[PDB]
Design a protein around this ligand. Structure first.
Ligand SMILES: Nc1ncnc2c1ncn2[C@@H]1O[C@H](COP(=O)(O)OP(=O)(O)O)[C@@H](O)[C@H]1OP(=O)(O)O
Lengths: 83, 49, 478, 97
């Protein structure tokens, strides 16, 4: 994670990673002309997407209205014993 | 992709739900699985598309 | 005994039946892009059209309602121009929905053709002319009977279903499938319709009812364990149309070999047919009182007068066989309503007229010889499948009316890739077994699944032959 | 539950024909008389035609185990996961509770 106002070592880090056979991932915080809360939340979302356990309680508050969402989309397959 | 389509259909039949409540429900009350995706935007016109 | 056991086993090996497997309701998906809905002008905004338009509207797609006049639905060029102008200056269609099959009327000028089949043929070949890549789904109402709870299926929509079956093979990409609907429009049924219409594929031939959703599939139906009831002993005059033909000749000699009184053969030529004299010679040698005729069956006056005068008074008509039909081969690209009129004249008109002129005399049975193309469908049988499909619907109509009708499906008589020929004696014995088992719509074909299954799947992926274990074994083998 | 509400509110009858994919000889197990072994006079009844359908990979169950698994267990697993998700509870975080 680069904690700068704009990534400058992302290229070098990616070049080192791809030249090592490692599955590391590089992220930055802000970018040129993008420094509002939107960019910070974008960086946090990217970090979470790469698999960093971001504590969303701080970002989105402690408790809100319990909005209901659809359940998991199971990818079912048929399993049955033949006679 | 099925999750995204189901969420889109569910939100379509809803009278302007609060985006922050949806974000909190998705973040806290759902399991984080392997393949992940995120939508970050400041206006409620691009989230549907 | 050994011969009887072997031949009975072989006979039951080639028995089949069409049915409607219930299946789980698909979750559905979003209706992506624009969908072109085409509706008859006679329906206007009534029942099904407005509700399906609303359903696709809430499905995420944009409906394009296009009312079409009944006369406009016949010509392919005029219909294609109508599609082009209605859809012009806009995105190409992602899919096409055809409600044109819902009109229960006949084409003016060609009274022995239904407006539905002609309109569907015009629509599909007009889409071929325009070169659009959209997938075509056609919806019907009261076209089939998933179970006994349904009313009897109507003829014209069954003909449309057969036409769609044959069209799906020669044009896999253009033709997607068919979805029957209940008689009454409803929002829930429309929602399920748009859900299935947006599916990926495989569910080609399906039907929607208040009970649920069903998929047409073929199963085995051996008659070894079913008891025999009302054994076939025709005593009176037996009317056979097209007796001078091949199948008619075979059926006539089968009738002669046991339980023959008077074989009233009817043909366009009659005596002039190539071998009528020899046929009547053997039939008389087997004790049959043959009486051939020279008249077209479609002419109501001709068959009415023939029944009036040519029927002996000492032998009322009990059994009637319909196996006469002109073989006008044609491809989907070269179809025209006149050709369907010529093909559908003999079969449908003769069956209807024979049924109508009856009902004053009791009938032991009323047999109809539908083809395997009605059940499976084969490339090139465009002009020929719909009449065979309508035969089953007519038989179902009369069975509901309370008459002894039969719609036996036939394969290839010994007198293609995968389908083997049928012997005269074995086929006749199978027909006997079907009649004495009271089969409303039997299917009598023999096929080698090891080649036919893989060939049919290569022609088009389908899930029709799912309940036959041989089909699954052949599919997994390849 | 929303599907059940849609069904009952619309007054839809869910009774339908027997399943054909379960190896039942449905053609040869129907006769009208009420006294015969192995035969029944009922044509239709409620069924789950997707009863055998199950997402084995989600719960870490191999296909061979799933084939030799009771459909009741599979349906109960899926329904319990759905119920926990609908309650606002993450089913994964209920571990050890
Ligand atoms: N409308 C009709 N009325 C009477 N006979 C008809 C008929 N349409 C077809 N046929 C007969 O039914 C016969 C069809 O049997 P077929 O052996 O000739 O070919 P196939 O058995 O493949 O249909 C036709 O040859 C024709 O013989 P005639 O033209 O001598 O009658």
């Amino acid at each position: 994670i680069e904690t700068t106002a704009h990534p400058v070592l992302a290229l070098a880090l990616e070049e080192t990673i791809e030249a090592t056979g490692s599955d590391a991932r590089v992220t930055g915080t802000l970018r040129r002309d993008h420094g509002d809360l939107t960019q910070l939340h974008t960086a946090l979302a990217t970090a979470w997407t790469h698999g960093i356990d971001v504590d969303w309680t701080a970002v989105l508050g402690d408790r809100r209205t319990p909005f209901e969402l659809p359940t998991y989309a199971f990818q079912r397959q048929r399993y049955w014993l033949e006679p | 992709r099925a999750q995204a389509r189901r969420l889109h259909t569910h939100l379509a039949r809803h009278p302007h739900p609060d985006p922050t409540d949806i974000a909190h429900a998705l973040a806290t009350t759902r399991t984080p699985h392997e393949h992940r995706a995120a939508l970050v935007t400041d206006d409620h016109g691009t989230r549907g598309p | 005994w050994r011969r009887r056991q072997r031949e009975q086993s072989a006979l039951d090996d080639l028995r089949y039946k069409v049915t409607w497997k219930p299946t789980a309701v698909a979750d559905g998906a979003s209706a992506t892009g624009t969908w072109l809905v085409v509706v008859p002008e006679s329906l206007a905004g009534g029942g099904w059209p407005v509700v399906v338009a609303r359903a696709v509207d809430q499905a995420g797609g944009r409906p394009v309602v296009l009312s079409v006049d009944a006369a406009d639905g016949a010509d392919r060029s005029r219909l294609g121009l109508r599609i082009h102008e209605a859809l012009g200056e806009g995105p190409v269609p992602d899919a096409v929905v055809s409600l044109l099959a819902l009109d229960p009327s006949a084409l003016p000028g060609l009274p022995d053709v239904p407006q539905a089949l002609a309109s569907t043929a015009a629509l599909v070949q007009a889409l071929l002319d325009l070169g659009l890549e959209a997938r075509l789904w056609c919806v019907t109402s009261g076209a089939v009977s998933v179970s006994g709870a349904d009313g009897p299926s109507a003829p014209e929509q069954a003909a449309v279903w057969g036409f769609g079956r044959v069209a799906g093979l020669e044009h896999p990409h253009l033709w997607a499938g068919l979805v029957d609907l209940p008689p009454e429009a409803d929002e829930r049924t429309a929602a399920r319709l748009v859900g299935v219409l947006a599916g990926a594929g495989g569910e080609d031939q399906v039907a929607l009812r208040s009970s649920g959703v069903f998929v047409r599939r073929l199963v085995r139906a051996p008659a070894s364990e079913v008891p025999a009831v009302r054994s076939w002993k025709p005593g009176g005059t037996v009317l056979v149309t097209g007796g001078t033909g091949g199948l008619g000749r075979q059926v006539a000699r089968w009738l002669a070999r046991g339980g023959a009184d008077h074989l009233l053969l009817v043909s366009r030529r009659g005596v002039d047919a190539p071998g009528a004299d020899e046929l009547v010679d053997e039939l008389t040698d087997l004790g049959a009182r043959v009486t051939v005729a020279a008249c077209d069956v479609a002419d109501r006056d001709a068959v009415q007068r023939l029944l009036s005068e040519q029927v002996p008074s000492d032998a009322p008509l009990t059994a009637v066989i319909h196996t006469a039909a002109v073989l006008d081969d044609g491809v989907i690209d070269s179809l025209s309503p006149e050709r369907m009129e010529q093909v559908l004249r003999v079969k449908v008109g003769g069956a209807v007229h024979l049924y109508e002129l009856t009902r004053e005399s009791d009938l032991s049975a009323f047999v109809l010889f539908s083809s395997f193309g009605s059940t499976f469908g084969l490339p090139g049988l465009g002009n020929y499948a719909p009449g065979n499909a309508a035969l089953e619907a007519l038989a179902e109509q009369w069975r509901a009316e309370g008459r002894p009708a039969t719609a036996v499906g036939w394969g290839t008589w010994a007198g293609t890739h995968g389908i083997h020929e049928l012997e005269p004696a074995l086929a006749t014995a199978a027909l006997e077994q079907a009649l004495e088992r009271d089969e409303s719509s039997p299917v009598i074909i023999d096929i080698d699944w090891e080649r036919f299954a893989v060939a049919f799947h290569a022609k088009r992926p389908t899930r029709g032959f799912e309940l036959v274990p041989e089909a699954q074994a052949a599919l997994e083998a390849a | 539950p929303e599907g059940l509400w849609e069904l009952v509110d619309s007054g839809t009858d869910a009774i339908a024909g027997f399943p054909l994919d379960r190896g039942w000889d449905v053609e040869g197990m129907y006769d009208p008389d009420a006294e015969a072994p192995g035969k029944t006079y009922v044509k239709e009844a409620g069924f789950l035609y997707d009863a055998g359908e199950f997402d084995a990979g989600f719960f870490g169950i191999s296909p061979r185990e799933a084939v030799s698994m009771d459909p009741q267990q599979r349906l109960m697993l899926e329904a319990s996961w759905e119920a926990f998700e609908r309650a606002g509870l993450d089913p994964a975080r209920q571990r050890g509770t």
